[PDB]
Amino acid sequence: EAEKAADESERGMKVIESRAQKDEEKMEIQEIQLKEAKHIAEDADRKYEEVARKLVI
Amino acid sequence: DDIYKAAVEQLTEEQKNEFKAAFDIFVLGAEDGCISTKELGKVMRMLGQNPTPEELQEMIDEVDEDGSGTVDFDEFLVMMVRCMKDDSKGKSEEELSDLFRMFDKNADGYIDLDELKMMLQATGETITEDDIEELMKDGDKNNDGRIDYDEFLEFMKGVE
Numbered sequence: 001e002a003e004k005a006a007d008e009s010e011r012g013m014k015v016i017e018s019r020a021q022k023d024e025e026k027m028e029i030q031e032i033q034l035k036e037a038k039h040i041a042e043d044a045d046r047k048y049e050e051v052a053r054k055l056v057i
Numbered sequence: 058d059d060i061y062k063a064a065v066e067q068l069t070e071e072q073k074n075e076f077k078a079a080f081d082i083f084v085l086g087a088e089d090g091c092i093s094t095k096e097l098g099k100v101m102r103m104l105g106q107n108p109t110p111e112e113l114q115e116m117i118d119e120v121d122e123d124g125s126g127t128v129d130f131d132e133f134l135v136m137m138v139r140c141m142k143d144d145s146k147g148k149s150e151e152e153l154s155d156l157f158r159m160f161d162k163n164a165d166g167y168i169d170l171d172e173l174k175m176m177l178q179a180t181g182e183t184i185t186e187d188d189i190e191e192l193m194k195d196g197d198k199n200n201d202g203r204i205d206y207d208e209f210l211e212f213m214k215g216v217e
Contacts, residue, residue: 046107 059145059217066143067134076137079103094126100136112139145217153213157206167204170196 067076083103084096093099097117101107116139120132128136138144160168173192182188195212196204 042105 059148063138063143063145064131064134067138072137072141072143075140076133079137079140080133094128096128097136100140104140108140108142112144115139147215148217150214153210156213157209160209167206168209170204 067073079100083099097113101113107113116135120135121127157168160172163169163172165172170192173196177184177188177192195208196202198208198212199205
């Protein structure tokens with residue numbers, strides 16, 4: 001019984017290992033995506049200030 | 058004008074951090090040898106906040122007007138002044154008022170066109186399409202030929 005339980009516990013441990021690795025991958029991908037998002041936001045902000053200036057004039 | 062004073066005042070705290078951080082982030086070297094002598098655009102890109110374009114254009118043109126094509130410690134200060142708001146910000150409107158007073162030392166009730174004629178004559182700038190056109194347009198901002206105070210007042214303002 002103990003040896004079978006050891007096999008199953010290692011099974012579960014390895015499954016959680018793999019899932020955590022996949023999650024880290026998705027985390028870094030979303031991280032680079034978020035940086036790109038921030039840059040797009042700043043560009044839009046600058047454009048907005050510019051067009052406001054033009055309209056006032 | 059205010060250029061040298063703005064360069065001098067660049068010795069400060071916020072812009073010092075800005076210049077040091079910009080160098081540490083995206084002034085490093087180890088390229089393929091393309092010579093980023095035009096790293097001005099790269100710095101504009103990597104700033105994260107682009108200032109008003111007049112700073113960028115005056116820096117692009119007036120810096121190395123002899124064609125030096127190189128950015129020095131002092132030119133680093135110039136670029137960083139272009140980054141922050143080290144501008145003279147339209148100089149002193151008191152100076153504009155005093156200039157217009159000297160213009161109407163004859164007291165025409167306004168800066169006469171011949172004031173502009175003699176001033177351009179002193180400055181000696183070639184009479185281009187811009188010349189005479191600017192003078193008449195400012196004087197005829199009403200498009201009626203009558204030069205008033207606020208006409209040249211707003212014509213000269215916004216500039217350093």
